[PDB]
Symmetry: C4
């Protein structure tokens, strides 16, 4: 039983590695390993037969579909959901799932505050920069990325073609982003700590 669990974890990790390696530019030996991992996945699934069973289903749907290029890239992407098959073995990942399910309102509030701040500061920086020639931002949607990476403090990069009002707006954006990403997050963190210590 524990040997079967360790085999399952090794097979999931092997499938993740094979995914990532077959995207490498240096590269059957991948398709045979892939079909072996999928044979094990579907054997485990058809022995077992919630969200973990849905994950086990999604873990083989792409392989069985591949037997417009947009749909093809979408399914080759959803082949990455094999990494969530580690949830059945990892207890911290199940705690993270319970936390995400229990703080849905707070995640929505975080996304809402970010949406509002992004629209606000993108409009502000677009209208601050639009008065000049060779404007940095071409539209308000063109500043959405800048606003996201400034509010999250990830950082944009080179802001040299920006003027004084653009930099004033950017300073306000940095401050407001710190605050707005700091307000919902403590509640999610408290939920995680609750579930974690309840488990252990």
């Amino acid at each position: 039983a524990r040997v079967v669990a360790i085999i399952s974890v090794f097979v999931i990790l092997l499938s993740i590695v094979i995914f990532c390696l077959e995207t490498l530019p240096e590269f059957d030996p991948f398709f045979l390993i892939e079909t072996l991992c999928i044979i094990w996945f579907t054997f485990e699934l058809t022995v077992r037969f919630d969200v973990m069973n849905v994950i086990d289903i999604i873990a083989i749907i792409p392989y069985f579909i591949t037997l417009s290029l947009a749909i093809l890239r979408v399914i080759r992407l959803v082949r990455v959901f094999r990494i969530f098959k580690l949830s059945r073995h990892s207890k911290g990942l199940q705690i993270l799932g319970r936390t995400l399910k229990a703080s849905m309102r707070e995640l929505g509030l975080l996304i809402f505050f970010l949406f509002i701040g992004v629209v606000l500061f993108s409009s502000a920086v677009y209208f601050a920069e639009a008065g000049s020639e060779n404007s940095f931002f071409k539209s308000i949607p063109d500043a959405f990325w800048w606003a996201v990476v400034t509010m999250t403090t990830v950082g944009y990069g080179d802001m040299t073609p920006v003027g004084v009002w653009g930099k004033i707006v950017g300073s306000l954006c940095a401050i407001a982003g710190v605050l707005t990403i700091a307000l919902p997050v403590p509640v999610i963190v408290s939920n995680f700590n609750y579930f974690y210590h309840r488990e252990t």
Copy 2:
């Protein structure tokens, strides 16, 4: 009474989308949608007749004004205050408003500490770099942006033309910024959590 609320939210979101799209470079169909959204806004306003009523007023003042380019960009910017019309429907946004109103002293203290740190580290880095040729910063105001994005950890970008003393000042700036943005923020976060859990 709930269908009217969902229509109001859809109209506010449509006006936000129309704002952002009419700034796009690909672009009457926007002015007719705009005048329809404003007709609904003013109908709701003149049926209703605090800060939310002021927001409802500001949401139509620009449209009615547009019937030096600096004033024009300023009013075309204040057309973005339609996004705060979501406060009447979103409870988290009203909680955020109550939080901001209740932590005014702490917001002022945050801005004050940032002002002091920005002046201090801009002076320090300007005088550290000014001893060389082709100085990175041309004045102490020219380093204000750098100091803001280093204290907020948003990051400046390429700091390669900076010397040893400039980098020592930058290290101190990073540390001091972490601390100063970390001191007022817990109080604002505690106020938000108080109002949020009082509501729910």
Copy 3:
């Protein structure tokens, strides 16, 4: 007695503005305003006659000295200590001073952990990159800045000439920096909140 306080705050702010503006490249009208601010500073000082009196002293020592270029830049820099004359009027800045005085051990521990992490990750990234040609870092001191801005999450900029081991070291540096800047800071924040709420 309150008009005198508001005059003092206006004069301190005017001296800060004059400092920052006389560094501008566009620029007696500054030296006369400066000597008026210093006449007021020394009048207030010689009417009054702790750390605030030391600040009042340092606020006029540069003006009275200016009546190798390294010493000159050093004193023209210490002219920035006029911004700490706002401590006598701002209560939050005195709270910040009390906090800094009460968390000296924690500030030293933060600086010590950063020193250790910086030396460690600078050595690691230098020896990871040194095996190649056109190495990004020329010495272990040459990576000190990179390590500081990666541990503080301020960010370095372009890390494209870095290899796989350099990026593994950089990932570890980012994680370890998050942790080490997160460990001492809560104690300083708790001290600040204690002093702040004790005052108010």
Copy 4:
């Protein structure tokens, strides 16, 4: 007994300085200082004779080995473990060691969540960008660094050759990284504060 401790701290600091300086491009006077520091290290070790004794051992193994270039760079790197000889004298560093030993599960959970987020967002951004010509990322491993520095908010640099879907994935990556680095860290911080206040 205290003079010997201050000599030991001075010798450790001198060896750290000599390490960092002998990597400088400007540079026996370093090898003689090095052999003196090692003579003191081994004298202290052979007078004393846990993890601190292992550190004292590792602090001289490289010098005694140097009496493929990969092994040589590896040992010249492990010469940096002299900086951990400060643990015997610094109490905060022993507190940090106790904290790291007591929060091993949480450190593993942090690394696990980062691994999962990195694989997820690297796959997502690779498949979002791969539909175009001159793709920014060449493989899913080629986006591992980008995902790490976006989730840690250290920042990547120039993301201009990235498209709309790449920037949507990057926004999600920034948000998810904030959350996942925010969930395990409070427990490690609480452990550190516990050990710190237990000591003092």
